[PDB]
Structures are given as C-alpha cells and as structure tokens.
Ligand binder design. Structure first.
Ligand SMILES: Cc1[nH]c2ccccc2c1CN1CCN(c2ccccn2)CC1
Length: 377
C-alpha cells in the first residue's frame, strides 16, 4: 500500500507549536510526500510563497534520509480556482508550454512528479469542454514524461491527480476509464463530505451512510465514493483513499440537540493555530476534548464527534483511521493519502498519543511499520 501525505506551504505561518516546516516531517512516515501548492503564470508552473525554493530544497532533501521516499508537487488548490487551468488546456500550444515548464521545474527542484489539484474540471467556473481537455492534458503529460525519462536516462516523472468526491462534480469533470490509463495514482478527496453550509451537523469523512441519508445524501460517504470511482472505470490499485487529519465544526442551533443532523446556525470557531473558520486540525480537536467537550461516537458511520455548549465537531481519530484502513485493505485499494501532515499531532503534545498519531496508525495498519528507512548511497 502507498501512504501519501500532503504538506502545505502556509503551515509555516502558524503561531508557536502550530508552525510546521519541511524539516518537521518524519522522512520514514509516508511513502509519498506531496507539496501544496504550486501556481501558474503565463501557462507555466510557478512558486506561490516567497520561500518556496528554499522549502523545496528542504522538502526534497528528506529523500537523503529515506532512499525509498518519493515526492510530488501539487499545482492548483481551492484559492487557485479554475481560470488558469481552463486557459492552459484551451489550446495545444498552451498545453505544450505548460508541460515543457513542468518537466524543467520538477527536474530543477528535484521532485519525482506532478499532482494535479484542479478543483475542478467542468465545475466551479470551468466549462464543459474541460472534462475531455483534462484527459488530453494528462495523457500528453504522461507521454511527455515517458519520452523525457528515456532522453535523460532517469526514472520517469509521475503524474497524479486529486479528484472530486461529489457525484455531480465527478460526472461533469472526469472521463474515468481514459483518465485512469495515464494517471499513476488517483487521490480521491473523500472528505469535506459535510459542513456548515448544509445547515445541520454532519461528518467530515464518514465511512458509511447515516440512516437519515436519503436520496443524493446517501452518496456522502467514503465507501460509496471510492466504489463509484472503481465501478465507473478506475482500477482499485490506482485508487488512493483520502484521509483527513482535521474536522469540520459547527455552531449548534440548540445545544441540547447534539446528534447527526442537528440544526446549526453556521461554521464553528476558528482554531487558535490553523485559524480556519469551521475547521479544526486534529491537534486543535484534542485541545477541545481536553477542555471538557463530550466525546461522541457515530456508530453507523464509524467516526467520532464531540460537543460542548453550542460547538459541535465531526472528525477522525485513531479508532476511525484504523477501521477505515481495515476496510481499505478488504477492498484492495492502492493505499491512503492524508490531508495533511501538518494537521496531525506532530509534536505529540496535544493528544498524548505519540508523534503523528493519525498517520502512524495508517503506517501500522497498511503493513508499513517495517518499511526500509535508510539514507541513499
Ligand atoms: C478549504 C480548506 N481549508 C483548509 C485548511 C485546513 C484544513 C483543511 C482545509 C480545507 C478543506 N479541504 C482540505 C483538503 N483539500 C484538498 C485540496 C487538494 C488536494 C487534496 N485535498 C480540499 C479542501
């Protein structure tokens, strides 16, 4: 199994114990590390943060401590939008310009591949033609990667994609069988499946449906989404299940109504470290629990929740990660990806479950505890 972990280049800006740099990553923890995010200018890949080059050096330098470790650069993200992607795929000339720039960039900064984080082809502003044009882009990149590997006689650069979990988004965004042929890995964003935008409490990443999930809401779980991808043309072994080391929080309309589907009045409070509206890092959730919150277990969906006063949080813990990992193995998927390494209790000081308790749980469950971790020759 692969264990693929996303690192975010804005985690450096978090105060005190929240600050997370490339050198805070345990090089032995994950099989793949992905750097979020890269941007685009004039159809060419670029940095985003002022110190990205320095961070690339430290990030990819982790491979000097684990000879097996592979790294990828993620282009796009939610704030990036679809506009530069649409413009870049719109003409073959723009695509060639992009692919050329990507090869140069990845080789220069010592990445082993590119992860497409276009959110999403065919939606969020992206026109209908982008569904097919994304397939074309991916194939062209893959084939360009294959050609380059032979000309310079080095291992081939990988091409992967983070892909939608919402059924409508999937249907308008991806030619699944064709896309699956050229992608090395398919990173399925099986989270953010519920949130305050809905007006009621719901789980970030429930494994199965809740009994009250009727109609289209019955698609809002990890099991349905992964099987949707598989059944519609993606090989199980290329499919990578998304695991969140963060939760979504809510303001309860009635503090005495604390179950799944309870009315909410909006997003819950930003955390003191991530400072994200309606989102808490796992280590931020541990503080919540330590400060007197009541623990809940959403049994049908195999995930925890917690509440105190008018604040309610749906998340993942050691127990839920373990359950999902067993499910993953039974279903013979390619492995797990994690958003994000910097949101797990990396110091171990918040949850008292050891360093990186959530990702370590995956490492153990997926048979990677004895994985080789030695500096290269
Ligand atoms: C929007 C947002 N901001 C945050 C700040 C801290 C923690 C979580 C979040 C999220 C929610 N998703 C996280 C996962 N993600 C992606 C994006 C690309 C690839 C994988 N996964 C989509 C947004």
């Amino acid at each position: 199994y692969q264990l693929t972990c996303y690192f975010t280049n804005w985690a450096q800006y978090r105060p005190g114990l929240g600050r997370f740099m490339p050198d805070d990553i345990n090089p032995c923890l994950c099989t793949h590390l992905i750097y979020a995010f890269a941007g685009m200018q004039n159809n060419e890949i670029t940095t985003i943060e002022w110190n990205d080059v320095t961070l690339y050096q430290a990030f990819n330098g982790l491979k000097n401590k684990n000879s097996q470790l592979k790294t990828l650069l993620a282009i796009g993200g939610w704030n990036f939008g679809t506009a530069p992607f649409t413009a870049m795929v719109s003409t073959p000339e723009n695509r060639q310009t992009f692919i050329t720039s990507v090869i140069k960039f990845l080789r220069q900064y010592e990445f082993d591949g590119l992860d497409f984080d276009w959110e999403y082809p065919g939606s969020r502003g992206s026109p209908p033609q982008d569904k097919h044009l994304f397939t074309v882009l991916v194939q062209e990149m893959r084939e360009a990667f294959e050609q380059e590997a032979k000309q310079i006689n080095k291992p081939r650069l990988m091409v992967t994609a983070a892909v939608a979990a919402g059924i409508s988004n999937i249907q308008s965004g991806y030619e699944i069988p064709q896309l699956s042929q050229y992608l090395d890995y398919i990173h399925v964003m099986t989270y953010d499946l519920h949130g305050s935008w809905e007006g009621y409490t719901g789980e970030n990443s429930p494994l199965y449906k809740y009994p009250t999930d009727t109609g289209s809401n019955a698609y809002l779980n990890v099991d349905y989404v992964m099987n949707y991808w598989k059944d519609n043309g993606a090989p199980a072994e290329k499919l990578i299940v998304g695991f969140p080391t963060y939760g979504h929080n809510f303001i309860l309309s009635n503090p005495s109504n604390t179950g799944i589907g309870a009315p909410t009045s909006g997003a819950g409070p930003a955390g003191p470290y991530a400072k994200e509206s309606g989102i808490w890092a796992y280590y931020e959730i541990c503080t919540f629990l330590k400060n007197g919150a009541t623990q809940g277990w959403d049994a049908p969906q195999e995930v925890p929740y917690a509440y105190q006063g008018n604040v309610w949080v749906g998340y993942d813990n050691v127990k839920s990660f373990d359950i999902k990992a067993q499910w993953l193995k039974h279903n013979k998927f390619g492995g797990a990806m994690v958003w994000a390494i910097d949101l797990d209790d990396f110091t171990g000081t918040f949850c008292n479950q050891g360093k990186f308790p959530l990702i370590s749980t995956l490492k153990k469950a997926l048979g990677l505890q004895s994985a080789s971790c030695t500096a290269p020759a």
